[PDB]
Amino acid sequence: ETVPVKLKPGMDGPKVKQWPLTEEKIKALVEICTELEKEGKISKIGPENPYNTPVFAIKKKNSTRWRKLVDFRELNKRTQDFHPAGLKKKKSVTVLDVGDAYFSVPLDEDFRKYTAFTIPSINNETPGIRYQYNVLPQGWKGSPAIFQSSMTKILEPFRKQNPDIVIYQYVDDLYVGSDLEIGQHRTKIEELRQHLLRWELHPDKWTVQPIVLPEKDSWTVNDIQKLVGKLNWASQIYPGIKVRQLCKLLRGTKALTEVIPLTEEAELELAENREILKEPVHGVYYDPSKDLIAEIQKQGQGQWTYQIYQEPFKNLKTGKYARMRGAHTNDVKQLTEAVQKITTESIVIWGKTPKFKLPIQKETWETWWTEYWQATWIPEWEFVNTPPLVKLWYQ
Amino acid sequence: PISPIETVPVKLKPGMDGPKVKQWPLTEEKIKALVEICTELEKEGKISKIGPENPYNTPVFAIKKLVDFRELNKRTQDFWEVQLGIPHPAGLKKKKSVTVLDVGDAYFSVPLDEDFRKYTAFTIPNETPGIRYQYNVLPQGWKGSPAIFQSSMTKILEPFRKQNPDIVIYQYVDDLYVGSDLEIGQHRTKIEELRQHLLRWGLYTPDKKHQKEPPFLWMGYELHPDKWTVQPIVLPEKDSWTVNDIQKLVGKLNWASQIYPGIKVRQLCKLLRGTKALTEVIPLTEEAELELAENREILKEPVHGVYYDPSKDLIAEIQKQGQGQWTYQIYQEPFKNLKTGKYARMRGAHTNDVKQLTEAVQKITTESIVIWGKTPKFKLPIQKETWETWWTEYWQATWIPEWEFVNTPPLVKLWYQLEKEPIVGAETFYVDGAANRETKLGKAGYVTNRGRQKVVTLTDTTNQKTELQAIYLALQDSGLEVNIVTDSQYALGIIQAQPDQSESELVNQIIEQLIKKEKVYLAWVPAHKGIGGNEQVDKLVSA
Ligand SMILES: Cc1ccnc2c1NC(=O)c1cccnc1N2C1CC1
């Protein structure tokens, strides 16, 4: 028995155009799909079906085998509708790919048409191969839901037999957190792996990083100026930040290189601001009824800074990401990684993907991101122009 | 020749209903014809007579038949897009031979969804009852007829394909391109086999004695199964030239620019300036003459290439033609081009060569993926150091697939570089600008540590043009090494980005100025604060 599902009132199925793919990735799919066809998970469709959703293939480099990924973002948005602060604190959380479970469940006939997608051909030599789902599609919002029941059961055992652990599900991913030192955590997981079969993350380390002010032995007109600007901007967050004494040391038309001693008051004003900046600003609270936002700036040399916030100047969390182990000189690589990492934390903390604001040109992102993606889900995003200001700050 | 292929189930847009239009008169002649014609299809099985229950109808015509479903189509569900994607020659892979079986009758021979047929009812015209039938097959000019015909085609081909892997087929409207690596007779044979297989489903197709012959002409080319040639292009020789003529000429010439090196249209395009009507005539300037003649020569030389060899790598090389213009050629073996093209300067806001090259490279990568499913190894007229220098410092994420430097000037370089720290022993200009946004009157000036100073009033300017202006003056009245401090973020941004081309004159001026200088350091400070020399110019450019 399959539960009936409907599109929000008035809405119609996606008719998103398919992106062109690499040979490498095209083959992967015909393979993956002829298999799914045999097993009857999906089936070829007729021209009378006008809907479409983009598909492509990635590999969580947790394998060398290819995995099929469908971009239901559009569909999910057009689909009717129907979280623990725990892990948010846990010592360690591990993520599990349960996409599979869905393929065990059949999809309401009347709704299948909407899940249509297309395997393209090169140079257009041929028409693409069109299929539509017969089971619950991975990445579809409706799936985790409908599979809820079956899911809860399956878990319950490991649940109240390990209550000293938290288990959260987000789409095709299961987040499991415990305080058990690495030894028991890793084993308890494998213990859970087999349990499901029979059918590294660290939350607290994520704080709003501190704004640091530079310390010089000698200050030039330039130096002071640069410091006053940063401070000034910073006053938006901390209204207590004063810049008067410093603005004094600068009055007159001096040369930028000219060195300037700091008046004892300038000294104070400065020391006082350093203090204020020793803690995130007060009164910042996650508002469930508002969109989460993630913004990222390219600091260069491999670094990237970012902020999750809902309202301007009231950051919920901020961070930096640098390139570890693996000669990576490829921005796009880095940015996709960066975006995943971040979407991940959001999910953990609040269990919601953030709306991204990317420092890259549409064309560039579109042409290559897919090449580095390694997640069952896909957040929302828009492209922008980094104001040099916001950059020197988080730098 | 009706097909015994399962029909595609059709339906009308959500909650709509069949066409109910009425036709009153036509001549004795126009009625005689239609009666005959119908009776023909009638028997062929194409159509049938309907009666009791069909409340639907449509205007029938006679043209020296024609049925207009304009209304039916509006009420017909949407189908799956036929796909505008077209194979491009450079994508094709060499074959020994390739014929084109022409279906034609194609659609008219495909069963129409039974259920839907009712809606396809039409009447013939002054007694009592006239003549009424309904379609039984995919009707000429109907909405789903294309879509439905191709799907059917594909099904019918699917087995044959699976049994003849070696054999490639391309379905294009009413034509079948079948090529292969078999010998001359084995091929001719398979085509025949293919034909009876098609004719085995009511899909009549021409015999070996009637099919069209190679090379086939395709979206611009003349192509055989082992090579292709740009079907040569001629330019009309004429006494008088109308605007319209000129325009088409430019289009042809423009298209040629892709394949043909050296084509130009500057003086030819000039002729359009001021034109009052398409039918107007323009005295071809002598300069236009020289150019027109010149192109005729370039068009004379034949150009031909070859297809893609999966067993070889692609190589794309780019040249910097003018400012923002780029030429590129793709090949698997030197001088043996697979495809070439050109990209016009995308005149935009404020950019620079490295960024632009980056885009060209991006455009090509995309195109290449579409055609070959792979991205070429690139040869770029840019120094590795240049690229490193630029990217590691550009605020935006940028990238270039694996490539290598090819020293084929002119090369793309950075026209100037801002200093990382203030210049020791260089004048310091504290520039500022601002304009009343209600009147658009503004002031822009500066002051320096070296006592110097200047200011200027401006009309109809805007805030941003003012601040830019301010920096221009500073750049002007400054000499080889400068330190400029502005309170404008707009400017900081623009310039911080090291632009070498813009559509704003002032910005161009500044750029020019920037290239001129020996060392320039631009710095920014918050506007309207007690801060430095800023509060000095702040006061002088007021309102
Ligand atoms: C127009 C067209 C589109 C796609 N492929 C082809 C063609 N036509 C050809 O003449 C052709 C030429 C060379 C190689 N493949 C070709 N064929 C392939 C089918 C044998």
SS3 A161: coil
Q: Is A173 annotated as a binding-site member?
A: yes
Domain of B132, CATH number, reads 3.10.10.10
Half-sphere exposure (Cβ direction) of A144: Cα atoms closer than 13 Å: 18
Task: Determine, for residues A388 and B492 on separate chains, whether the beta-carbon distance falls below 8 Å.
Answer: yes
Take residue B455 and report the two structure tokens written for it. 């200011």
> Domain ends where: B119, B145, B171?
B145
- Identify all chain B residues contacting A368, using CB atoms and an 8 Å cutoff: 399
Q: Report the alpha-carbon distance of residue A90 to residue B508 in Å, rounded.
A: 57
Say whether both B407 and B341 belong to one domain.
yes
How many Å lie between the centroid of ligand 1 and the Cα of residue B88? 9
Sign of CA dihedral B110, B206, B198, B44: positive
Q: Quickly list DSSP for B437-464.
A: TTT--EEEEEEBTTS-EEEEEESS--HH
In this structure, the strands spanning A381-383 and A355-358 are parallel
Cβ pair A61, A374 in contact under 8 A: yes
> Do the bridges between strand B427-430 and strand B432-435 make them parallel or antiparallel, or are there none, so unpaired?
unpaired
Q: Nearest CA of chain B to the CA of A171: how many Å?
A: 29
Domain boundary residue among B415, B448, B465? Answer: B415
Which residue in chain B has the smallest CA separation from A303? B392
Read off the tokens for B114.
């039974």
Q: For residue A335, what are its two tokens?
A: 């940015």
- Interface check for A252 against chain B (CB to CB < 8 A): the answer is yes
Q: Are residues B408 and B284 in the same domain?
A: no
Q: Are residues B384 and B485 in the same domain?
A: no
CA distance B29 to chain A (A): 40
CA of B92 to the centre of ligand 1 (A): 6
Q: Is the CB of B170 under 6 A from ligand 1?
A: yes
Say whether residue A303 is in contact with chain B using an 8 A CB cutoff. no
Q: Does B531 touch chain A (CB under 8 A)?
A: yes
Which residues touch A51 (CB under 8 Å, ≥6 apart)? A13, A14, A15, A113, A114, A115, A116
* Residue A9 in contact with partner chain B when CB distance is under 8 A: no
- Do residues B448 and B526 both lie within one domain? yes
Q: How far is CA A292 from the centre of its chain?
A: 11
Relative orientation angle of helices B184-199 and B145-163, to the nearest 10 degrees: 130
* Cβ-based burial of B33 (10 A; exposed 0-12, middle 13-18, buried ≥19): middle
Residue with tokens 């000294």: A267
Q: How many CB atoms lie within 10 A of CB B384?
A: 11
Contact A256, B422 (CB under 8 A): yes
CB contact under 8 A, B523 and A256: yes
Specify the 3-state DSSP secondary structure of A59: coil
Amino acid making up residue B82: V
Among candidate residues B313, B520, B497, the one with its CA nearest the CA of residue B427: B520
Number of Cα atoms under 13 Å in the Cβ half of residue A142 = 28
With 0-12 CB in 10 A as exposed, 13-18 as middle and 19+ as buried, what is B527? middle
Q: Residue of the nearest CA to atom 20 in ligand 1? A: B179
A97 is in an annotated binding site: yes
Read off the tokens for A379: 């957040």
Residue B452 is part of a domain; what is its CATH number? 3.30.420.10
Contacts of B251 (CB under 8 A, 6+ apart): none
| Minimal-distance CA residue of chain B relative to A118 | B80
Q: Is residue B53 located within the same domain as residue B139?
A: yes
B105 CA to centre of own chain: 32
A218 touches chain B (CB under 8 A): no
> Could you tell me the maximum CA-CA distance found in chain B, to the nearest angstrom?
106
Q: What is the DSSP letter of A386?
A: -
Between helix B489-496 and helix B463-476 the angle, nearest 10°, is 60
| Binary contact (B395, A221; C-beta < 8 A) | no
Query: How many residue pairs bridge chain A and chain B with CB atoms within 8 Å of each other?
Result: 186
Instruction: Tell me if A225 sits within 8 A of B532, measured CB to CB.
Output: yes
Task: Identify the CATH number of the domain in which residue B290 sits.
Answer: 3.30.70.270
Ligand 1 centroid, distance to B121 Cα (angstroms): 40
- The answer to whether residues B294 and B351 belong to one domain is no
In angstroms, the Cα distances linking B505 to B222, B353, B501 are: 46, 18, 10
- Which one-letter DSSP state was computed for residue B149? H
Separation of alpha carbons B257 and B264, rounded Å: 8
Of B88, B95, B222, B307, the residue with max ligand 1 atoms within 8 A of its CB, to mutate for a pocket test, comes to B95
Same domain (yes/no): B174, B100: yes
Is the separation of the CB atoms in B68 and B61 below 8 Å?
A: yes
Spatial contact of A23 and B373, defined as CB atoms under 8 Å apart: yes
Atom of ligand 1 nearest to the CA of B218: 1
Please tell me if residue A130 touches chain B, with a CB cutoff of 8 Å.
Answer: yes
Q: What angle do CA B41, B44, B50 make, to 5 degrees?
A: 60
3-state secondary structure B201-251: CCCCCCCCCCCCCCCEEECCEEECCCCEEECCCCCCCCCCCEHHHHHHHHH
Testing ligand 1's pocket by substitution, the residue of B97, B171, B221, B223 carrying the most ligand atoms inside 8 A of its CB is B223
Distance between CA atoms of residues B98 and B184, nearest Å: 10
Cβ–ligand 1 distance for B405 under 6 Å, the answer no
| Domain final residue, candidates B308, B343, B362 | B308
The continuous run of DSSP H or E covering A88 comes out as none
**From the list B399, B421, B525, which residue is nearest A228 (CB)?**
B525
Q: Are residues B74 and B28 in the same domain?
A: yes
Is the CB of A387 less than 8 angstroms away from the CB of B489?
A: yes
Q: How far apart are CA B89 and CA B330, in angstroms?
A: 13
- Enumerate domains of chain A plus CATH numbers: 1-85+103-143 (3.10.10.10), 86-102+144-175 (3.30.70.270), 176-286 (3.30.70.270), 287-393 (3.30.70.270)
- The residue whose CA is least distant from atom 18 of ligand 1 is B179
List the alpha helices (DSSP H) in B373-527.
Answer: 384-391, 463-476, 489-496, 505-516
Query: Quick check: B359 and A363 CB within 8 A?
Result: yes
B477 is in an annotated binding site: no
Are B190 and B231 in a shared domain?
no
Tell me how far apart the alpha carbons of residues A226 and A210 are, in angstroms, rounded to a whole number. 18
Q: Is B49 helix (H, G, I), strand (E, B) or coil?
A: strand
Q: How many domains does chain B have?
A: 5
Question: Is residue B217 within 8 Å of residue B233, measured between CB atoms?
Answer: no
* Residue from B106, B85, B93 nearest B168 by CA: B93
Q: Which residue of A has its CA nearest to B530?
A: A247
Bridge-based pairing state of the strands B377-380 and B315-320: parallel
- Shared domain for B193 and B98, answered yes or no, is yes
What is the domain range of residue B20? 1-82+108-145
Same domain? For B300 and B317 the reply is: no
Q: Which atom of ligand 1 is nearest to the CA of B215?
A: 10
Residue given tokens 């479970």 in the structure block? A101
Phi, psi at A309, each rounded to 5°: -155, 160
Put residue B3 in one of left, alpha, beta given phi > 0 → left and psi -120 to 50 → alpha. beta
The kind and range of the H/E element at A202 are none
State how far the Cα of A279 lies from the Cα of A277, in Å rounded to an integer: 5
Separation of first and last alpha carbons in chain A:
56
* Residue B346 sits in the same domain as residue B258: no
Question: Buried (b) or exposed (e) across A293-327, using 16+ Cβ within 10 A?
Answer: bbbbbbbeeebbbbbbbbeeeebbbbbebebeeee
Indicate which residue's Cα is closest to atom 15 of ligand 1. Answer: B92
Q: Are B71 and B21 in contact (CB under 8 A)?
A: yes
Q: Does B38 touch chain A (CB under 8 A)?
A: no
For residue A82 the two structure tokens come to: 């129907």
d(CA B58, CA B504): 58
